[PDB]
Structure 1
């Protein structure tokens, strides 16, 4: 038996493998898709939320592996349907949707959600959208996967106006959202703690589907910040953090030791 998280959720033996929760997916109104535990609210718990923004041209289903993976850990994961998530607006609309649905008398989400534990994540233009959305006071932490910030609705003003800590992921072989042009400015302008991991040899497609080597670390990040999972702290924090000592990763950290 792994120790429970600080917010009362089950502990896990692997961040890269499925959690304990059976999952389902479906519409969350006309503008969003949800991946979530089939049963919400066991043990009187309220579920944290991850909001997702798709890459350019993509749909929620492009990332169904990663999104259902987080759902299996206990997260209610809501994806904006749009293939152009760059302004962050569609993603923040997801928070509005879940807020409404949580505050209803009855419904799937009625008094089942922890609105104080919302994070955001996305790929490419959706990673840019994550940074745009990450300015909002309701977004506690972000995880942009290979963000595209040099066009497609991005406003670089957002980068110095983040609400909470960022786990910036890039691939060193990403030629679509080149990290020098797209991620280095984000890191430099950030007003919050930033953990930047650049996965060695990773292309722009690594985040697709089950998100490959980004899956485990992104799960650790949200479990740490949204679930107070102590066991995840050592992935990011301390001099010899797991990412820091793993040669697959090139790490830069700002406001984190």
Structure 2
């Protein structure tokens, strides 16, 4: 692929705290229109353009909740912006609008001569990661046709309508023990509703409470192996990452209580 970055991968490469690039960050003021500000993480030392990803939290949570994803994913070769919403009380439709405004914001930074990410962003290769109500927001955006990869984390929403209309390869992380967005009412029906025409996966984390997809605790191995691979394969067309997503006996992993998907990915 024209978009491939980094060494030929292994589980060890994915399990490491960082990928091949050093990372820097830049704050985006909450005064910005369209969302509550955030932090842009980006790799240093690179040339050319790369995929860009927005990461969004859930109800009454801040960007810190999901910020493990920022440096982790950036270090493999992505521009990754973790955001706050306008208020913690925003619901999924509002969160979808703010994901779109944050994506537009990154797109705009690519051509701003003062931006630290000027010229780094392939504005046709965009992804989204979102927790809980932000994961409902993620599925809403996935149904709109712009983004090329979606990772809902312990999603919450009031309908499966948008999941049934997803236009982007979608990996849902579920948390087995979730009592806030119970899997039987949210992540499972949303996955089950996804169309047959997209690459898709459901990874339910064994014993996980509702925060199990956020990163930064005891679940980084599964989150890394599936999550980085998902963005590599779907944003970079990097078929070197298929080996992690299709082949292995996922349910047999101690960290996975349930797996579903439509491998092989073609």
The TM-score with structure 2 as length reference comes to 0.83
Could you tell me how far 1:131 is from its partner in structure 2? 0.6
The answer as to 2:223 corresponding to 1:224 is no
How many angstroms apart in 2 are the aligned matches of 1:15 and 1:183?
25
Could you tell me how far 1:203 is from its partner in structure 2? 1.1
Query: What secondary structure, in the 3-state scheme, does the structure 2 residue paired with 1:48 have?
Result: strand
Could you tell me how far 1:143 is from its partner in structure 2? 0.8
Structure 1: stretches of 5+ with no match in the other structure: none
Contact 2:4-2:238 at 8 Å conserved across structures? no
Task: Please name the residue that 2:130 is paired with.
Answer: 122
Q: Aligned runs of 1:209-248 on 2, under 5 Å?
A: 209-210=215-216, 212-213=219-220, 214-216=222-224, 217-237=226-246, 240-241=247-248, 243-248=250-255
Residues 37 and 242 of structure 1: CA distance in aligned 2, closer, same or farther (over 3 Å)? farther
Contact 1:54-1:125 at 8 Å conserved across structures? yes
Task: Please name the residue that 1:204 is paired with.
Answer: 210
Match of 1:56 among 48, 56, 59: 59
Task: Please name the residue that 2:72 is paired with.
Answer: 69
Higher deviation after alignment, 163-172 or 107-116: 107-116
Structure 1 ranges of 4+ moved more than 6 A: none
Match of 1:111 among 111, 119, 129: 119
Query: What secondary structure, in the 3-state scheme, does the structure 1 residue paired with 2:181 have?
Result: coil
How many angstroms apart in 2 are the aligned matches of 1:184 and 1:38?
35
Equivalences, count: 245
The answer as to 2:193 corresponding to 1:189 is yes
Could you tell me how far 1:252 is from its partner in structure 2? 1.1
How many angstroms apart in 2 are the aligned matches of 1:79 and 1:134?
18
Structure 2: stretches of 5+ with no match in the other structure: none
Residues 105 and 137 of structure 1: CA distance in aligned 2, closer, same or farther (over 3 Å)? farther
Residues 112 and 148 of structure 1: CA distance in aligned 2, closer, same or farther (over 3 Å)? same
